[PDB]
Protein backbone atom coordinates (compact mmCIF):
# COMPACT_ATOMS: atom_id res chain seq x y z
CA UNK A 1 0.00 0.00 0.00
CA UNK A 2 2.43 2.63 1.25
CA UNK A 3 5.81 2.57 -0.52
CA UNK A 4 8.66 2.30 1.95
CA UNK A 5 10.85 5.23 2.91
CA UNK A 6 13.66 6.28 0.60
CA UNK A 7 16.20 5.23 3.24
CA UNK A 8 15.44 1.88 4.91
CA UNK A 9 17.16 1.45 8.24
CA UNK A 10 20.37 -0.52 8.69
CA UNK A 11 21.27 -2.97 11.44
CA UNK A 12 25.02 -2.49 10.99
CA UNK A 13 26.82 0.83 11.31
CA UNK A 14 30.22 1.65 9.80
CA UNK A 15 33.35 0.73 11.73
CA UNK A 16 34.88 3.82 13.39
CA UNK A 17 38.18 5.27 12.22
CA UNK A 18 41.48 4.09 13.66
CA UNK A 19 43.67 6.84 15.10
CA UNK A 20 47.15 7.29 13.66
CA UNK A 21 49.55 10.19 14.08
CA UNK A 22 51.77 10.11 11.00
CA UNK A 23 48.59 9.40 9.06
CA UNK A 24 46.91 12.40 10.65
CA UNK A 25 49.98 14.42 9.76
CA UNK A 26 49.49 13.09 6.23
CA UNK A 27 45.81 13.99 6.52
CA UNK A 28 46.93 17.53 7.31
CA UNK A 29 49.53 17.47 4.54
CA UNK A 30 46.82 16.42 2.08
CA UNK A 31 44.62 19.44 2.78
CA UNK A 32 47.72 21.64 2.77
CA UNK A 33 49.08 20.36 -0.55
CA UNK A 34 45.79 20.40 -2.45
CA UNK A 35 45.57 24.13 -1.68
CA UNK A 36 49.32 24.60 -2.24
CA UNK A 37 50.12 23.08 -5.63
CA UNK A 38 47.18 24.84 -7.32
CA UNK A 39 49.57 27.81 -7.57
CA UNK A 40 51.83 25.90 -9.97
CA UNK A 41 51.37 27.36 -13.49
CA UNK A 42 50.47 23.84 -14.63
CA UNK A 43 47.18 24.65 -12.95
CA UNK A 44 44.99 26.85 -15.15
CA UNK A 45 42.04 29.08 -14.35
CA UNK A 46 40.27 31.22 -16.91
CA UNK A 47 42.26 34.03 -18.55
CA UNK A 48 41.30 37.54 -17.49
CA UNK A 49 38.49 39.10 -19.53
CA UNK A 50 35.52 41.49 -19.60
CA UNK A 51 36.78 44.62 -17.83
CA UNK A 52 34.35 47.53 -17.40
CA UNK A 53 36.32 50.58 -18.61
CA UNK A 54 39.99 51.55 -18.57
CA UNK A 55 40.64 53.07 -15.14
CA UNK A 56 44.22 53.82 -14.13
CA UNK A 57 43.66 51.63 -11.08
CA UNK A 58 44.23 48.76 -13.52
CA UNK A 59 47.69 50.20 -14.19
CA UNK A 60 48.61 50.31 -10.50
CA UNK A 61 47.21 47.02 -9.16
CA UNK A 62 47.90 45.33 -12.53
CA UNK A 63 48.38 41.55 -12.56
CA UNK A 64 51.81 40.22 -13.55
CA UNK A 65 52.45 37.01 -15.48
CA UNK A 66 55.19 35.72 -17.76
CA UNK A 67 54.89 32.88 -20.24
CA UNK A 68 55.72 29.36 -19.09
CA UNK A 69 59.00 27.59 -19.85
CA UNK A 70 58.53 23.93 -20.84
CA UNK A 71 61.29 21.78 -22.28
CA UNK A 72 61.43 22.98 -25.89
CA UNK A 73 63.54 19.94 -26.88
CA UNK A 74 61.04 17.19 -25.95
CA UNK A 75 57.59 17.98 -27.39
CA UNK A 76 56.34 18.16 -31.00
CA UNK A 77 56.84 21.21 -33.18
CA UNK A 78 53.73 23.19 -32.22
CA UNK A 79 54.78 23.16 -28.53
CA UNK A 80 55.69 26.85 -28.53
CA UNK A 81 53.93 28.27 -25.44
CA UNK A 82 52.94 31.63 -26.94
CA UNK B 1 17.25 3.41 -64.03
CA UNK B 2 15.95 3.55 -60.44
CA UNK B 3 16.58 -0.16 -59.94
CA UNK B 4 20.23 0.09 -60.97
CA UNK B 5 21.57 3.49 -59.86
CA UNK B 6 23.26 1.81 -56.89
CA UNK B 7 25.57 -0.20 -59.15
CA UNK B 8 23.41 -3.31 -58.73
CA UNK B 9 19.91 -4.43 -59.63
CA UNK B 10 17.80 -3.84 -56.51
CA UNK B 11 14.28 -5.16 -56.88
CA UNK B 12 11.19 -3.75 -55.19
CA UNK B 13 11.23 -6.00 -52.13
CA UNK B 14 11.47 -5.68 -48.37
CA UNK B 15 15.15 -6.54 -48.83
CA UNK B 16 15.66 -4.11 -51.69
CA UNK B 17 13.85 -1.38 -49.78
CA UNK B 18 16.18 -1.75 -46.80
CA UNK B 19 19.14 -1.56 -49.19
CA UNK B 20 17.70 1.55 -50.85
CA UNK B 21 16.09 3.83 -48.25
CA UNK B 22 17.60 5.03 -44.98
CA UNK B 23 15.00 6.92 -42.92
CA UNK B 24 13.26 5.00 -40.14
CA UNK B 25 9.50 5.60 -40.22
CA UNK B 26 8.99 4.48 -43.81
CA UNK B 27 10.76 1.22 -42.96
CA UNK B 28 8.65 0.87 -39.83
CA UNK B 29 5.51 1.59 -41.85
CA UNK B 30 6.17 -0.98 -44.57
CA UNK B 31 7.19 -4.34 -43.07
CA UNK B 32 9.33 -6.01 -40.42
CA UNK B 33 8.34 -3.11 -38.20
CA UNK B 34 9.39 -4.24 -34.72
CA UNK B 35 12.69 -5.60 -36.03
CA UNK B 36 13.53 -2.27 -37.67
CA UNK B 37 12.44 -0.32 -34.59
CA UNK B 38 14.52 -2.29 -32.10
CA UNK B 39 17.57 -2.37 -34.37
CA UNK B 40 17.26 1.39 -34.88
CA UNK B 41 17.17 2.04 -31.14
CA UNK B 42 20.18 -0.27 -30.87
CA UNK B 43 22.12 1.79 -33.43
CA UNK B 44 21.05 5.09 -31.91
CA UNK B 45 20.10 6.38 -35.35
CA UNK B 46 19.14 9.97 -35.80
CA UNK B 47 16.52 10.59 -38.47
CA UNK B 48 15.69 13.75 -40.36
CA UNK B 49 12.16 14.76 -41.34
CA UNK B 50 12.96 14.85 -45.05
Amino acid sequence: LKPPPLFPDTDYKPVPLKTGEGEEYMLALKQELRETMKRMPYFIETPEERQDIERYSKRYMKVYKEEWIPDWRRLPREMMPR
Amino acid sequence: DLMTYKGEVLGITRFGLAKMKESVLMLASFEKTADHLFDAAYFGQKDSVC
Binding site: - | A34, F38, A41, Y42, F43, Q45, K46
Partner: protein, 339 residues
Protein backbone atom coordinates in the same frame (compact mmCIF):
# COMPACT_ATOMS: atom_id res chain seq x y z
CA UNK C 1 8.52 47.58 -14.22
CA UNK C 2 8.60 44.24 -16.05
CA UNK C 3 11.20 41.92 -17.55
CA UNK C 4 10.81 41.13 -21.24
CA UNK C 5 9.22 37.77 -22.08
CA UNK C 6 9.62 35.81 -25.28
CA UNK C 7 5.97 35.07 -26.01
CA UNK C 8 6.66 32.23 -28.46
CA UNK C 9 9.06 31.07 -31.15
CA UNK C 10 7.91 29.57 -34.44
CA UNK C 11 9.69 26.21 -34.37
CA UNK C 12 10.00 23.14 -36.58
CA UNK C 13 11.20 19.57 -36.08
CA UNK C 14 14.75 18.85 -37.24
CA UNK C 15 15.42 15.20 -36.39
CA UNK C 16 14.18 12.20 -34.48
CA UNK C 17 16.88 10.46 -32.42
CA UNK C 18 16.01 6.93 -31.31
CA UNK C 19 17.73 5.59 -28.22
CA UNK C 20 17.52 3.71 -24.94
CA UNK C 21 16.79 4.76 -21.37
CA UNK C 22 18.62 3.61 -18.23
CA UNK C 23 16.98 2.48 -14.98
CA UNK C 24 18.03 5.77 -13.41
CA UNK C 25 16.75 7.77 -16.36
CA UNK C 26 13.48 5.86 -16.01
CA UNK C 27 13.27 6.88 -12.36
CA UNK C 28 13.94 10.49 -13.26
CA UNK C 29 11.18 10.52 -15.88
CA UNK C 30 8.50 8.96 -13.66
CA UNK C 31 5.98 10.95 -11.64
CA UNK C 32 5.08 8.17 -9.16
CA UNK C 33 5.73 4.53 -8.42
CA UNK C 34 2.92 1.97 -8.30
CA UNK C 35 3.29 -0.78 -5.73
CA UNK C 36 -0.11 -2.47 -5.51
CA UNK C 37 -1.67 -5.42 -7.32
CA UNK C 38 -5.26 -4.29 -6.66
CA UNK C 39 -6.92 -1.47 -8.57
CA UNK C 40 -10.25 -0.48 -6.96
CA UNK C 41 -11.48 0.11 -3.44
CA UNK C 42 -13.61 -2.78 -2.21
CA UNK C 43 -16.35 -0.28 -1.33
CA UNK C 44 -19.44 0.46 -3.41
CA UNK C 45 -17.81 3.52 -4.98
CA UNK C 46 -15.33 1.48 -7.07
CA UNK C 47 -12.85 4.28 -6.44
CA UNK C 48 -9.33 3.77 -7.86
CA UNK C 49 -6.51 2.97 -5.50
CA UNK C 50 -3.94 5.64 -4.68
CA UNK C 51 -0.82 3.49 -5.17
CA UNK C 52 -2.40 0.95 -7.52
CA UNK C 53 -2.68 1.06 -11.27
CA UNK C 54 -5.31 3.46 -12.68
CA UNK C 55 -4.16 6.07 -10.18
CA UNK C 56 -5.73 9.24 -11.56
CA UNK C 57 -2.52 10.99 -10.52
CA UNK C 58 -1.10 9.27 -13.62
CA UNK C 59 -3.80 10.65 -15.92
CA UNK C 60 -7.49 10.42 -16.75
CA UNK C 61 -9.86 8.00 -18.47
CA UNK C 62 -13.20 9.70 -17.86
CA UNK C 63 -15.21 12.85 -18.47
CA UNK C 64 -15.75 13.87 -14.84
CA UNK C 65 -12.42 14.75 -13.19
CA UNK C 66 -8.92 15.98 -14.02
CA UNK C 67 -5.83 14.00 -13.19
CA UNK C 68 -4.20 14.81 -9.89
CA UNK C 69 -0.99 15.76 -11.75
CA UNK C 70 -1.82 18.21 -14.54
CA UNK C 71 -5.02 19.38 -12.84
CA UNK C 72 -7.25 19.51 -15.94
CA UNK C 73 -9.86 17.29 -17.55
CA UNK C 74 -9.55 14.64 -20.25
CA UNK C 75 -9.96 17.19 -23.05
CA UNK C 76 -6.34 18.38 -22.59
CA UNK C 77 -4.40 16.10 -20.20
CA UNK C 78 -1.47 14.83 -22.26
CA UNK C 79 -0.90 11.93 -19.87
CA UNK C 80 1.76 11.00 -17.37
CA UNK C 81 3.83 8.01 -16.28
CA UNK C 82 4.41 5.75 -13.35
CA UNK C 83 7.00 3.03 -12.95
CA UNK C 84 7.46 -0.39 -11.36
CA UNK C 85 10.51 -2.43 -10.42
CA UNK C 86 11.20 -6.13 -10.75
CA UNK C 87 12.77 -8.25 -8.02
CA UNK C 88 15.25 -9.91 -10.39
CA UNK C 89 16.53 -8.82 -13.82
CA UNK C 90 14.79 -10.09 -16.96
CA UNK C 91 15.58 -9.90 -20.67
CA UNK C 92 13.72 -7.48 -22.93
CA UNK C 93 12.95 -9.92 -25.79
CA UNK C 94 13.10 -7.04 -28.25
CA UNK C 95 16.85 -6.81 -27.65
CA UNK C 96 17.50 -10.50 -26.95
CA UNK C 97 19.39 -10.81 -30.23
CA UNK C 98 21.48 -7.87 -29.05
CA UNK C 99 22.31 -9.62 -25.78
CA UNK C 100 23.43 -12.84 -27.44
CA UNK C 101 25.45 -10.91 -30.00
CA UNK C 102 27.24 -9.02 -27.24
CA UNK C 103 27.95 -12.14 -25.17
CA UNK C 104 29.33 -13.72 -28.34
CA UNK C 105 31.58 -10.76 -29.16
CA UNK C 106 33.38 -10.33 -25.81
CA UNK C 107 35.94 -12.29 -23.83
CA UNK C 108 34.22 -13.53 -20.68
CA UNK C 109 37.21 -13.33 -18.34
CA UNK C 110 38.14 -9.69 -18.98
CA UNK C 111 35.24 -8.14 -20.91
CA UNK C 112 37.42 -7.01 -23.84
CA UNK C 113 36.68 -7.76 -27.50
CA UNK C 114 39.23 -10.18 -28.95
CA UNK C 115 40.76 -7.88 -31.55
CA UNK C 116 44.30 -7.32 -32.80
CA UNK C 117 45.67 -3.80 -32.51
CA UNK C 118 45.93 -3.90 -36.29
CA UNK C 119 42.26 -4.84 -36.37
CA UNK C 120 41.49 -2.08 -33.88
CA UNK C 121 43.25 0.42 -36.13
CA UNK C 122 41.44 -0.81 -39.26
CA UNK C 123 37.99 -0.69 -37.72
CA UNK C 124 38.44 2.61 -35.89
CA UNK C 125 39.57 3.96 -39.26
CA UNK C 126 36.37 2.69 -40.88
CA UNK C 127 34.53 4.41 -38.02
CA UNK C 128 36.37 7.60 -38.96
CA UNK C 129 35.19 7.10 -42.53
CA UNK C 130 32.82 9.97 -43.46
CA UNK C 131 29.26 9.31 -44.52
CA UNK C 132 28.78 6.06 -42.61
CA UNK C 133 25.44 4.50 -43.56
CA UNK C 134 23.09 2.00 -41.95
CA UNK C 135 23.94 -0.59 -44.60
CA UNK C 136 27.62 0.09 -44.02
CA UNK C 137 27.13 -0.42 -40.29
CA UNK C 138 25.54 -3.76 -41.19
CA UNK C 139 28.62 -4.53 -43.25
CA UNK C 140 31.06 -3.74 -40.45
CA UNK C 141 28.94 -5.67 -37.96
CA UNK C 142 29.18 -8.70 -40.24
CA UNK C 143 32.90 -8.50 -40.97
CA UNK C 144 34.05 -7.79 -37.42
CA UNK C 145 31.79 -10.49 -35.99
CA UNK C 146 33.35 -12.86 -38.52
CA UNK C 147 36.95 -12.04 -37.64
CA UNK C 148 36.10 -12.29 -33.93
CA UNK C 149 34.02 -15.49 -33.91
CA UNK C 150 36.97 -17.31 -35.50
CA UNK C 151 39.00 -16.47 -32.38
CA UNK C 152 39.34 -18.87 -29.46
CA UNK C 153 42.08 -17.28 -27.33
CA UNK C 154 42.01 -13.81 -25.78
CA UNK C 155 44.98 -11.51 -26.30
CA UNK C 156 44.17 -9.38 -23.25
CA UNK C 157 43.69 -11.69 -20.27
CA UNK C 158 45.54 -14.82 -21.37
CA UNK C 159 42.73 -17.36 -21.61
CA UNK C 160 40.49 -18.95 -24.23
CA UNK C 161 36.71 -18.88 -24.54
CA UNK C 162 33.96 -21.36 -25.34
CA UNK C 163 31.00 -20.42 -27.50
CA UNK C 164 27.49 -19.12 -26.82
CA UNK C 165 24.51 -21.42 -27.42
CA UNK C 166 20.80 -21.21 -26.76
CA UNK C 167 19.30 -23.48 -24.10
CA UNK C 168 15.69 -22.97 -25.07
CA UNK C 169 13.66 -19.85 -25.76
CA UNK C 170 14.48 -16.77 -23.67
CA UNK C 171 17.51 -18.64 -22.25
CA UNK C 172 21.16 -18.85 -23.26
CA UNK C 173 24.30 -20.85 -22.38
CA UNK C 174 28.02 -20.82 -23.13
CA UNK C 175 30.28 -23.78 -23.91
CA UNK C 176 33.32 -23.04 -21.74
CA UNK C 177 34.21 -26.01 -19.53
CA UNK C 178 32.40 -28.91 -21.18
CA UNK C 179 34.44 -31.90 -22.22
CA UNK C 180 36.03 -30.78 -25.48
CA UNK C 181 36.28 -32.66 -28.77
CA UNK C 182 39.91 -31.50 -28.83
CA UNK C 183 40.35 -33.47 -25.57
CA UNK C 184 40.06 -31.80 -22.17
CA UNK C 185 42.82 -29.63 -20.76
CA UNK C 186 44.24 -30.47 -17.31
CA UNK C 187 41.65 -28.10 -15.82
CA UNK C 188 39.24 -31.02 -16.20
CA UNK C 189 40.90 -32.33 -13.03
CA UNK C 190 39.99 -29.08 -11.28
CA UNK C 191 36.41 -29.36 -12.52
CA UNK C 192 36.24 -32.92 -11.19
CA UNK C 193 37.72 -31.95 -7.82
CA UNK C 194 35.26 -29.07 -7.47
CA UNK C 195 32.49 -31.69 -7.73
CA UNK C 196 34.10 -33.93 -5.09
CA UNK C 197 31.80 -33.03 -2.19
CA UNK C 198 28.71 -33.14 -4.41
CA UNK C 199 29.72 -36.57 -5.73
CA UNK C 200 30.36 -37.90 -2.22
CA UNK C 201 27.08 -36.59 -0.82
CA UNK C 202 25.27 -37.26 -4.12
CA UNK C 203 26.83 -39.82 -6.46
CA UNK C 204 24.01 -39.23 -8.96
CA UNK C 205 25.90 -36.14 -10.16
CA UNK C 206 28.83 -38.19 -11.46
CA UNK C 207 27.06 -39.35 -14.67
CA UNK C 208 26.20 -35.68 -15.29
CA UNK C 209 29.23 -33.54 -14.44
CA UNK C 210 30.85 -34.31 -17.80
CA UNK C 211 27.99 -32.39 -19.46
CA UNK C 212 28.47 -29.14 -17.52
CA UNK C 213 28.17 -25.80 -19.31
CA UNK C 214 28.41 -22.11 -18.45
CA UNK C 215 25.01 -21.58 -16.83
CA UNK C 216 24.88 -17.84 -17.42
CA UNK C 217 21.63 -16.16 -16.35
CA UNK C 218 20.22 -12.64 -16.71
CA UNK C 219 21.69 -11.48 -13.39
CA UNK C 220 25.29 -12.40 -14.20
CA UNK C 221 24.94 -11.14 -17.77
CA UNK C 222 23.79 -7.75 -16.52
CA UNK C 223 26.69 -7.83 -14.08
CA UNK C 224 29.04 -8.55 -16.99
CA UNK C 225 27.86 -5.60 -19.08
CA UNK C 226 28.44 -3.29 -16.10
CA UNK C 227 32.20 -3.66 -16.60
CA UNK C 228 32.69 -3.21 -20.38
CA UNK C 229 35.66 -0.92 -21.14
CA UNK C 230 34.49 2.47 -22.35
CA UNK C 231 36.99 2.31 -25.21
CA UNK C 232 35.39 -0.96 -26.38
CA UNK C 233 31.84 0.45 -26.42
CA UNK C 234 31.45 2.10 -29.86
CA UNK C 235 32.95 -0.82 -31.80
CA UNK C 236 29.70 -2.60 -31.06
CA UNK C 237 28.37 0.06 -33.45
CA UNK C 238 26.29 1.45 -30.59
CA UNK C 239 26.46 5.22 -30.30
CA UNK C 240 27.60 5.59 -26.67
CA UNK C 241 25.45 8.71 -26.28
CA UNK C 242 22.26 7.01 -27.50
CA UNK C 243 22.33 3.78 -25.48
CA UNK C 244 24.92 2.08 -23.29
CA UNK C 245 25.18 -1.73 -22.96
CA UNK C 246 23.79 -1.56 -19.43
CA UNK C 247 20.33 -0.64 -20.72
CA UNK C 248 19.91 -3.65 -23.02
CA UNK C 249 18.84 -5.38 -19.80
CA UNK C 250 16.05 -4.05 -17.63
CA UNK C 251 14.96 -3.88 -14.01
CA UNK C 252 12.09 -1.37 -14.18
CA UNK C 253 9.11 -0.64 -16.39
CA UNK C 254 7.02 2.42 -17.07
CA UNK C 255 3.29 2.11 -16.56
CA UNK C 256 2.03 4.18 -19.50
CA UNK C 257 -0.72 6.79 -19.09
CA UNK C 258 -4.38 5.86 -18.79
CA UNK C 259 -5.34 7.62 -22.03
CA UNK C 260 -3.06 5.12 -23.78
CA UNK C 261 -5.31 2.36 -22.40
CA UNK C 262 -8.79 3.68 -21.56
CA UNK C 263 -10.57 1.05 -19.48
CA UNK C 264 -14.35 1.11 -19.91
CA UNK C 265 -16.91 -1.60 -20.69
CA UNK C 266 -14.52 -1.94 -17.45
CA UNK C 267 -11.24 -3.63 -18.36
CA UNK C 268 -8.44 -3.08 -20.86
CA UNK C 269 -5.71 -5.28 -22.28
CA UNK C 270 -2.57 -3.53 -21.02
CA UNK C 271 -4.22 -2.82 -17.67
CA UNK C 272 -4.89 -6.36 -16.50
CA UNK C 273 -1.95 -7.75 -18.45
CA UNK C 274 0.30 -5.62 -16.25
CA UNK C 275 -1.73 -6.46 -13.16
CA UNK C 276 -0.46 -9.98 -13.87
CA UNK C 277 3.16 -8.83 -13.74
CA UNK C 278 2.75 -6.92 -10.49
CA UNK C 279 0.90 -9.82 -8.86
CA UNK C 280 3.59 -12.33 -9.79
CA UNK C 281 6.22 -9.87 -8.56
CA UNK C 282 4.51 -9.62 -5.17
CA UNK C 283 4.27 -13.42 -5.17
CA UNK C 284 8.01 -13.82 -5.58
CA UNK C 285 8.46 -11.04 -3.01
CA UNK C 286 6.53 -13.06 -0.43
CA UNK C 287 8.52 -16.08 -1.59
CA UNK C 288 11.69 -14.21 -0.60
CA UNK C 289 10.54 -14.84 2.95
CA UNK C 290 9.43 -18.45 2.47
CA UNK C 291 12.24 -20.86 3.32
CA UNK C 292 11.47 -22.44 -0.04
CA UNK C 293 13.78 -24.67 -2.08
CA UNK C 294 15.56 -23.63 -5.29
CA UNK C 295 13.35 -24.99 -8.08
CA UNK C 296 10.31 -22.83 -7.36
CA UNK C 297 12.62 -19.83 -6.93
CA UNK C 298 14.14 -19.96 -10.38
CA UNK C 299 10.79 -21.07 -11.79
CA UNK C 300 9.07 -17.95 -10.45
CA UNK C 301 11.88 -15.90 -11.93
CA UNK C 302 11.33 -17.44 -15.36
CA UNK C 303 7.58 -16.89 -14.94
CA UNK C 304 8.22 -13.16 -14.49
CA UNK C 305 10.38 -13.35 -17.61
CA UNK C 306 7.59 -15.08 -19.56
CA UNK C 307 5.05 -12.51 -18.39
CA UNK C 308 7.17 -9.60 -19.59
CA UNK C 309 7.73 -11.38 -22.90
CA UNK C 310 3.97 -11.54 -23.33
CA UNK C 311 3.65 -7.91 -22.22
CA UNK C 312 5.66 -6.93 -25.28
CA UNK C 313 4.06 -9.26 -27.86
CA UNK C 314 1.92 -12.37 -28.22
CA UNK C 315 3.12 -14.69 -31.03
CA UNK C 316 5.97 -16.27 -29.06
CA UNK C 317 6.53 -19.83 -30.25
CA UNK C 318 8.57 -22.03 -27.93
CA UNK C 319 6.49 -22.49 -24.76
CA UNK C 320 5.69 -26.04 -23.53
CA UNK C 321 2.05 -26.95 -23.43
CA UNK C 322 1.72 -26.62 -19.62
CA UNK C 323 1.75 -22.78 -19.48
CA UNK C 324 0.96 -21.85 -23.07
CA UNK C 325 -0.75 -18.52 -23.83
CA UNK C 326 -4.38 -18.68 -22.75
CA UNK C 327 -5.89 -16.45 -25.45
CA UNK C 328 -5.12 -13.80 -28.04
CA UNK C 329 -3.58 -10.69 -26.50
CA UNK C 330 -2.76 -7.29 -27.98
CA UNK C 331 0.70 -6.48 -26.74
CA UNK C 332 2.42 -3.38 -28.03
CA UNK C 333 3.84 -5.17 -31.07
CA UNK C 334 0.38 -6.41 -32.00
CA UNK C 335 -1.21 -2.94 -31.90
CA UNK C 336 1.43 -1.68 -34.33
CA UNK C 337 1.04 -4.85 -36.42
CA UNK C 338 -1.18 -5.31 -39.43
CA UNK C 339 -3.55 -3.32 -41.62
Amino acid sequence: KEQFRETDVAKKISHICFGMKSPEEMRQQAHIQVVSKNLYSQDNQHAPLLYGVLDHRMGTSEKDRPCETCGKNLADCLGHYGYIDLELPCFHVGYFRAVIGILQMICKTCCHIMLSQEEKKQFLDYLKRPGLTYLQKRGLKKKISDKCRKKNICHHCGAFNGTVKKCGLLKIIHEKYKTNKKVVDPIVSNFLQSFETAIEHNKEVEPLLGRAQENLNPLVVLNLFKRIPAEDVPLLLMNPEAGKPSDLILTRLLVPPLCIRPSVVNEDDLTMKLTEIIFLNDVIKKHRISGAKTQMIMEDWDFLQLQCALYINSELSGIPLNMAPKKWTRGFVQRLKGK
